[PDB]
Ligand binder design. Sequence first.
Ligand SMILES: Cc1cc(O)cc(=O)o1
Ligand SMILES: [Ca+2]
Ligand code: NA
Ligand SMILES: [Zn+2]
Length: 369
Amino acid sequence: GGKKKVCYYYDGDIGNYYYGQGHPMKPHRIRMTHNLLLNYGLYRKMEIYRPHKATAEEMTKYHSDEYIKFLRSIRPDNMSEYSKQMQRFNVGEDCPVFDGLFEFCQLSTGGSVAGAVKLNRQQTDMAVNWAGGLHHAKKSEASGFCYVNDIVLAILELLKYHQRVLYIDIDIHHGDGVEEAFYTTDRVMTVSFHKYGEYFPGTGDLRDIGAGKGKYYAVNFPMRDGIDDESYGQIFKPIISKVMEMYQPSAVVLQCGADSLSGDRLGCFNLTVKGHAKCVEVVKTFNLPLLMLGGGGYTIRNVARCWTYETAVALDCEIPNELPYNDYFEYFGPDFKLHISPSNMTNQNTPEYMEKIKQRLFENLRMLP
Ligand SMILES: Cc1cc(O)cc(=O)o1
Ligand SMILES: [Ca+2]
Ligand code: NA
Ligand SMILES: [Zn+2]
């Protein structure tokens, strides 16, 4: 279907935002990703844009006025005066107050919405924003290290010109905030693959299928610890092929959270970078306008490898396994290679479990017109 035009979004300030001592979310990983892919030469093959800052008003296309007014006002120096509001909006613990919090949200969001506009205008085939994908944020509260739902805002932009939009989420966590926003409409189908059972955020059972006009337009594949490349590959291409056939979307959003990789500080899966990136290859073959976003990922050397390789896949550009010199070279020892090995952890997802869940999801997809 030909090679694709790619527009990529990055702000050089993004890596300086700091969630605080000990916090696993590290914006620096987006700077590591950028520096690695520049050193592979991938800037020669794509257009690189700075995101604009999304305004408070633009954010209220989804979020409440009261929540956005609070996010644009709260600072470490005035926290004591805002104790009540912090609790209501779920800020100040897992989702801390840090210097420049609102600006970080504006740049994360700006990349996703700018990419959506470029796709709507038919000025690109693919848009990429590795600072986006913050899928847990809700209408009026922060959740799961996410404050503003850049994904929901980008999908609302795509819906100006697309009757049906497909959302796919390969982060290890359930895409709860995106699913909730579109739970009662058939104009967005949401498809999430995730660890389920005594795990954050607690939602995404296979029996969660949507409601009202949106019944059968939410799809959830719950998984156990230790899934590997073979098992994930067993089910991803067949599921997405059936969704494409039945739903017939005109645009796609793919959240590429890297916390589903082997060795993640918070995750419990066993995928390689090649296994994760096979998902990008499958979605790209349908030749639809595609927005590719970031997400979780807590072992930062592997996040940089994953998103560098997935940028190369979007470009159909082969790159060597030997890493080029870069500003973070020491982070990639002791091997200094791009690709990673799986661990010897047990895969609790039997082949029979994988086929049975797939078969139940196929039953629900037969209910589409
Ligand atoms: C992404 C996330 C958020 C959180 O509060 C706990 C966790 O384990 O993972
Ligand atoms: Ca997911
Ligand atoms: Na929906
Ligand atoms: Zn996650």
